[PDB]
Amino acid sequence: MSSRLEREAARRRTFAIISHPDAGKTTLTEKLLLFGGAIQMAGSVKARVTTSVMQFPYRDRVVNLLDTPGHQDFSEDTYRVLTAVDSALVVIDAAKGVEAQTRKLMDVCRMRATPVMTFVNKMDREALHPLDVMADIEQHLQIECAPMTWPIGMGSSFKGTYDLLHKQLHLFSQSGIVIHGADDPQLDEYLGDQAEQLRMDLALLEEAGTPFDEERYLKGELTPVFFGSAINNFGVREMLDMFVEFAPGPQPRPAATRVVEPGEEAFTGVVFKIQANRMAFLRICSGTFTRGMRLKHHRTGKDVTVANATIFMAQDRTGVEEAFPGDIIGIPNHGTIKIGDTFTESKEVLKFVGIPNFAPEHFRRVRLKNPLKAKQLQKGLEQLAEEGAVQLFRPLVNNDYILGAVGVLQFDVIVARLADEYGVDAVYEGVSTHTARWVYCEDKKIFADFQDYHRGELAVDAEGALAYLAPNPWRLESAMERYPKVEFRTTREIS
Numbered sequence: 020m021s022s023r024l025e026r027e028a029a030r031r032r033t034f035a036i037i038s039h040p041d042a043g044k045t046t047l048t049e050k051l052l053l054f055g056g057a058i059q060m061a062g063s064v065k066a067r068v069t070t071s072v073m074q075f076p077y078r079d080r081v082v083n084l085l086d087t088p089g090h091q092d093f094s095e096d097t098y099r100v101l102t103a104v105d106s107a108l109v110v111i112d113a114a115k116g117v118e119a120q121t122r123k124l125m126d127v128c129r130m131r132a133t134p135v136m137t138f139v140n141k142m143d144r145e146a147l148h149p150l151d152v153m154a155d156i157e158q159h160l161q162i163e164c165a166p167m168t169w170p171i172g173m174g175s176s177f178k179g180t181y182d183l184l185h186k187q188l189h190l191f192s193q194s195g196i197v198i199h200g201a202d203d204p205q206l207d208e209y210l211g212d213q214a215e216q217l218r219m220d221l222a223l224l225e226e227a228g229t230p231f232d233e234e235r236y237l238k239g240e241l242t243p244v245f246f247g248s249a250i251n252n253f254g255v256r257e258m259l260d261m262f263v264e265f266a267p268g269p270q271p272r273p274a275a276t277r278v279v280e281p282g283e284e285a286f287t288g289v290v291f292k293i294q295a296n297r298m299a300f301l302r303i304c305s306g307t308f309t310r311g312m313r314l315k316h317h318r319t320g321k322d323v324t325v326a327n328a329t330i331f332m333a334q335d336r337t338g339v340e341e342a343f344p345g346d347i348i349g350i351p352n353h354g355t356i357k358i359g360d361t362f363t364e365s366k367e368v369l370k371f372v373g374i375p376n377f378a379p380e381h382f383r384r385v386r387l388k389n390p391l392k393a394k395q396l397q398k399g400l401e402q403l404a405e406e407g408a409v410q411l412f413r414p415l416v417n418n419d420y421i422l423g424a425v426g427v428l429q430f431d432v433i434v435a436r437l438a439d440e441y442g443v444d445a446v447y448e449g450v451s452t453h454t455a456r457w458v459y460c461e462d463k464k465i466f467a468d469f470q471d472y473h474r475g476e477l478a479v480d481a482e483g484a485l486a487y488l489a490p491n492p493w494r495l496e497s498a499m500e501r502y503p504k505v506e507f508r509t510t511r512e513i514s
């Protein structure tokens with residue numbers, strides 16, 4: 020029945036953690052790696068390409084945890100990682116609830132209907148009450164919460180958790196203690212006065228809580244919520260068990276001509292990011308990757324050998340070097356590549372769709388220190404935008420170069436690269452813009468009118484796409500009203 024390819028692909032669980040800085044991602048990542056027996060990798064993560072992709076075995080699943088750069092390293096590449104996973108894990112600091120970056124990263128997951136599980140971290144310190152945390156998750160992540168584990172107390176009074184389906188009490192300071200219904204005197208023996216509160220909460224959950232439903236989880240409509248304390252490696256086992264059991268394996272991926280299924284024998288993969296020193300990171304969409312093989316780079320029309328590929332793999336497995344759907348590989352190259360590029364082993368022309376550019380929130384105008392360098396600046400900005408390092412907008416009404424960054428670090432990298440690779444010394448000037456949307460209107464007449472009236476706010480980006488630049492989302496909301504026929508989108512397909 021199942022081929023070797025389909026058996027391997029079915030074992031993969033490829034995901035990333037979405038969280039706001041200081042929620043606990045690094046700490047939880049270290050503990051996950053320890054369950055995976057990935058001792059060295061955990062030591063590496065705790066000490067801070069090697070860590071962009073961490074693969075580890077757990078309960079015979081091959082888990083691929085892709086890093087989502089955060090803090091000062093937050094960039095459009097963080098959102099690009101989310102286009103390569105089949106599911107995500109949300110980590111929240113229980114004292115803060117859903118925070119700004121949690122929401123923006125969930126907005127990306129939502130466009131892709133990516134399933135998400137949720138870990139509420141730091142229950143060992145005073146926290147939002149669990150009913151309030153659940154309401155906050157639903158309100159800001161726009162998803163139903165299905166509690167899987169439920170905390171008893173918080174902070175100094177945090178006794179541990181009760182696992183609703185496994186009927187197990189997990190004590191905080193280790194095997195769960197099996198509990199036999201709400202009346203089990205084991206609850207009073209282990210929880211003391213807090214047993215009454217667990218009983219009240221369980222009664223409330225029975226009446227008003229949402230059960231886990233795998234189909235709703237897989238559609239992105241419901242998230243299983245776990246509570247714990249990653250620093251104590253507590254509650255993490257239950258969440259990981261649930262993740263390997265229920266999180267989706269490699270999913271079909273749309274291409275312009277058809278949907279590609281992971282069980283197709285012929286290799287296909289898509290580039291979702293590029294690291295400059297260059298390495299292109301490819302998600303394997305179907306088929307089997309082997310070092311030996313030849314791949315067709317359909318954009319350039321060239322054949323590419325991959326004898327120098329990086330196969331990210333666990334310290335653990337030993338056999339012949341191959342990689343399967345859901346896995347990530349890195350292909351070194353001398354600058355040939357765009358985000359979204361498709362590689363195939365067959366001659367079938369395939370073009371994966373659905374890796375977009377994302378609307379930037381930070382904008383700067385570029386100024387040259389030396390006017391004689393104008394052609395080099397145009398070359399460098401165009402090549403850096405084609406490569407995905409920044410977005411570039413050219414306003415209809417002037418000749419300015421306006422750069423759009425998802426993360427501010429990007430502006431520093433562009434200046435560095437302009438200097439080093441183009442011999443161009445550029446500085447930034449501030450602009451009013453904080454918002455871009457790509458505009459579209461299937462009515463040719465109304466659109467010409469829009470483009471005439473709002474000519475001062477329109478720009479064309481490096482892909483040729485028309486965009487409305489606004490000082491902020493509220494000023495934007497006002498142009499939308501004047502033209503209820505024009506669509507304003509927060510993403511656009513790369514070509």
Ligand SMILES: Nc1nc2c(ncn2[C@@H]2O[C@H](COP(=O)(O)OP(=O)(O)O)[C@@H](O)[C@H]2O)c(=O)[nH]1
Pocket residue numbers: 038039040041042043044045046047140141142143144247248249250251
């Ligand atoms: N008290 C407590 N502190 C935690 C827990 N998890 C992480 N921290 C602390 O919170 C801070 C942020 O943790 P980190 O894992 O680096 O967060 P990141 O920015 O999301 O990767 C550090 O001081 C951690 O020790 C937890 O479960 N309980």
